[PDB]
Structure 1
Amino acid sequence: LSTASVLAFERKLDPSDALMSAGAWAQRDASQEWPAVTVREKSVRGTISNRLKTKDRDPAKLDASIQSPNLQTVDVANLPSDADTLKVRFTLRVLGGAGTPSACNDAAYRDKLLQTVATYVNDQGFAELARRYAHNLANARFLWRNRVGAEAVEVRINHIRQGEVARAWRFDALAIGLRDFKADAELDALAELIASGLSGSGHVLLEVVAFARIGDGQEVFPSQELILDKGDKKGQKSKTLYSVRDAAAIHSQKIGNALRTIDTWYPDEDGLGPIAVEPYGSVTSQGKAYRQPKQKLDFYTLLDNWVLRDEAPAVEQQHYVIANLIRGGVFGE
């Protein structure tokens, strides 16, 4: 038995584009029509700080490093000085029916994959994936950068099915540790909601509102869009902050990778901080290729053993297998 030529799945835990708003004090009890953080631009004088060749024998670089400097534009999305809470608001849905392939080809591979993932789901539930997804939602790991140096990263996740709110979650992300796979009470209530949404026994719409307390006009950093070889230095060549209509914003694939940590059995040291789940589990944030195909921590080896060759891996490896059967992705040759 072998795989199919093209496998694919869909983006379960599908997030949206964030809406970084801000406002004055004590209106965050009922923060509805606060103004947002935009993308505004300002100049900068680029005097070079990059590394230079040793034994600088030529004073021509001594001259031209400073005598002919650069002048470019860097956009900076500071908050207003009258406001302190980076209200990162977005939404997040959960499809469910994870092992159902979006576009498979081979029926026998599909049969073994369906019965194997159903064996998982009705044997050992989605509560571990739910607890770690509710932890990654409980802190602000979806904020890749804005978590460092804060007062009270105060999340308010809410559950909406019809046009009304249900209850009020009030957290921190300093009392909640960054790396702890613990099990609280109300966090396991919200994790029970995520478990009900994930396993296919219903449907869930989770919007996530993190009150990042960064400061009275302190600089935040949304994502940077690319640029090509058709624009000069003047014309925002260096940095362009991602935006929506008169507001700055955060990408969907970026939050949607920063809410999917299950893999804390990469071989080197989980104590050095967890990672983001991918097949050939790699972190371009640190550029290093964990889970070599030389080893047997390759996901494609894991799925080809847990489906094809009928040799099941460790339970923690199976949590990882369904983490990147539930993140989506292209598969197959």
Structure 2
Amino acid sequence: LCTHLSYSRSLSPGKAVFFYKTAESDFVPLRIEVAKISGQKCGYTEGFDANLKPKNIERYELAYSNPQTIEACYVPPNVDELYCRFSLRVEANSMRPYVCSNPDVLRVMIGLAQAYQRLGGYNELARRYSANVLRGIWLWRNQYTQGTKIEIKTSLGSTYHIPDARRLSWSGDWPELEQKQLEQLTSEMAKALSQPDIFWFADVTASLKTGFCQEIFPSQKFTERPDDHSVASRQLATVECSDGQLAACINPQKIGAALQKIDDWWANDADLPLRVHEYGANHEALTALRHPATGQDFYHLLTKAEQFVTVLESSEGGGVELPGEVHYLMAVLVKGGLFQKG
């Protein structure tokens, strides 16, 4: 192909904030607190050296405590509902390369995006993204509630409401008056993703029914180990409110990673879906599912466009003929990045 090729990102979210209501004011932030604790002396190198060779210490030396400083966050007594919200904008921005160093490569990438659009296929991507919003998986470790409600508004005037999100699976069929809203939402998004000159903007709120003083899990900061012992080892992310107070939040890219978890196209065995990645990275197992050695990765597939366009053009469309390799590639172009040295 060519020395330089790249796309920017087409689907971008905001920062999510936690808050609650009172009888006296409509918006009170949830906030974090800091505290000293007494820890344990446990684990390897604490008692063993090399490969299971005990080291020489006295019996009493492990009964001592290990103090630490952490930040933490809890819902205060007597709050019945906790609320969380974020904004979302979607642009039809995978139709054109941000940069390209070769006119012959450029005309081909354009041909492909269009050949795909008219046969169907944006619906498929929209259905998958839509499902992840309405399921609620973007709450990560805070999904364990006594009841979760999700509400969405858009710039076109529509409103959607899931009376209880706790049971919607990735694989399966949704209850009536829920399955239907998934279809309607899919239509708005499928268009926003591919047709330009449409402004679309969404506002997603949810509510969590909680326990008496339940623990809450906001995003964590990346830090250096302090050398002071007066500074926290585990620091949490907050956002500044319009009134000057700070509140617990979830970072944009953490919301984003959840929304794009849609890849169950690998190895012809769906399992659970992966975060889209050029090499099929699997963070839980610390490995990769589309190792270059298999021929299944993005970079091998990027060179078969001429063959794919030929098929797309020869196909009738409107059926189930689109192959995994074409869908995969379109999903990667949506999460744009650097595809150079080709």
TM-score of the alignment, normalized to the shorter chain, above 0.5: yes
CA contact (8 A) 2:173 2:179 kept: no
Any gaps of 5 or more consecutive residues in structure 1? Answer: none
* Inter-CA distance 274–309: structure 2 relative to 1 (3 Å threshold): closer
SS of residue matched to 2:292: coil
Residue 20 of structure 1, CA deviation: 1.2
User: What is the Cα deviation at residue 81 of structure 1?
Assistant: 2.3
How much has 1:33 moved relative to structure 2? 2.7
Match status 1:120 vs 2:116: yes
CA RMSD of aligned residues (A): 2.6
Q: Name the amino acid aligned to 1:153.
A: T
Q: Choose from 200, 207, 216 the match for 1:220.
A: 216
1:34 has 2:30 as partner = no
TM-score using structure 1 length:
0.86
- Alignment partner of 2:97 out of 83, 98, 101: 101
Question: In structure 1, what is the Cα distance between the partners aligned to 2:227 and 2:171?
Answer: 42
Partner of 2:291: 292
- Paired residue total: 317
Q: Percent identity?
A: 26
Deviations 1:214-233 (A, max 9, x none): 43331111111111255433
Q: How does 1:119-268 map to 2 (within 5 A)?
A: 119-147=115-143, 149-160=144-155, 166-180=158-172, 184-201=179-196, 202-229=198-225, 231-237=227-233, 239-245=234-240, 246-267=246-267
Shift of 1:167: 3.0
Task: Tell whether the 8 Å contact from 2:117 to 2:194 is kept in structure 1 after alignment.
Answer: yes
Post-superposition CA distance 1:110-131 (Å, at most 9, x none): 1101110111112223111111
- Please give the alpha-carbon distance, in whole angstroms, between the structure 2 residues aligned to 1:175 and 1:295: 36
**Which residue of structure 2 lines up, in the alignment, with residue 7 of structure 1?**
5
Per the TM alignment, residue 191 of structure 1 is displaced from its structure 2 partner at its CA by 1.2
* 3-state SS of 1:21 partner: strand
**Does the C-alpha gap of structure 1 residues 297 and 116 become closer, same or farther in structure 2, counting only changes over 3 Å?**
same
Deviates more, 1:100-109 or 1:210-219: 210-219
1:281 and 2:274 aligned: no
Q: Secondary structure, in 3 states, of the residue corresponding to 1:145?
A: helix
User: Which one-letter code corresponds to 1:35 in the other structure?
Assistant: V
Gap regions ≥5 residues in structure 2:
241-245, 313-321
Cα distance in 2, alignment partners of residues 50 and 23 from structure 1: 44
Preserved contact between residue 9 and residue 93 of structure 2 (Cα < 8 Å): no
Runs of 4+ in 1 over 6 A off after TM superposition: 308-313
Give the 3 Å change call, closer, same or farther, for CA 231–115 of structure 1 in structure 2: farther
User: What amino acid maps onto 1:247 in structure 2?
Assistant: A
CA spacing shift, 1:34–1:7, aligned 2, 3 Å: same
CA distance in structure 1 between the aligned counterparts of 2:126 and 2:238, rounded to whole angstroms: 31
1:203-243 superposed Cα distances (whole Å, 9 cap, x missing partner): 21112112233433311111111112554333012x11111
Q: Deviations over 1:135-155 (max 9, x none)?
A: 0101112222212x2222211
Structure showing greater radius of gyration is 2
1:89 to 85, 91, 99: 85
CA distance in 2, matches of 1:171, 1:286: 35
Give the Å deviation of 1:157.
Answer: 1.4
Aligned-partner SS, 1:270: coil
- Is 2:312 the partner of 1:317? no
TM-score (normalised: structure 2): 0.84
Separation of aligned partners in 1, 2:72 and 2:260: 29
Q: Comparing both structures, which one devotes a greater share of its residues to helix?
A: 2
Question: What amino acid does structure 1 have at the position aligned with 2:302?
Answer: L
